[PDB]
């Protein structure tokens, strides 16, 4: 009777870890959008001190 619960415990646990992984690598990547979109707001600091 307990063993069964154990089962849908295992279940739903590794689908939680499918979860987190994912959200994990997600946060890297939203994170990388933040390193790129930054270097290059400037190198947009050319294009704008040139105009100047």
């Amino acid at each position: 009777e307990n063993g069964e619960k154990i089962t849908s415990l295992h279940r739903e646990v590794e689908k939680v870890k499918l979860d987190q992984k994912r959200l994990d690598q997600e946060l890297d990547f939203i994170l990388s959008q933040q390193k790129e979109l930054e270097d290059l707001l400037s190198p947009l600091e050319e294009l704008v001190k040139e105009q100047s």
Binding site: E1, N2, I6, L9, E12, V13, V16
Partner: protein, 50 residues
């Protein structure tokens, strides 16, 4: 015949020993389990809600 009762009561009693033996052996370990899985299930709900 009274060799005899020396043995039969003896094999019977030998058996009561095992009966005692099982009696000695009894559960709390078991009772413990439902409590824990009931508990682990709950933490899983946490993590999930998190």
């Amino acid at each position: 015949i009274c060799q005899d009762v020396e043995n039969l009561q003896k094999f019977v009693k030998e058996q009561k020993q095992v009966q005692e033996e099982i009696s000695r052996m009894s559960s709390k370990a078991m009772l413990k389990v439902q409590e824990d899985i009931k508990a682990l299930k709950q933490l899983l709900s946490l993590a999930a809600n998190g």
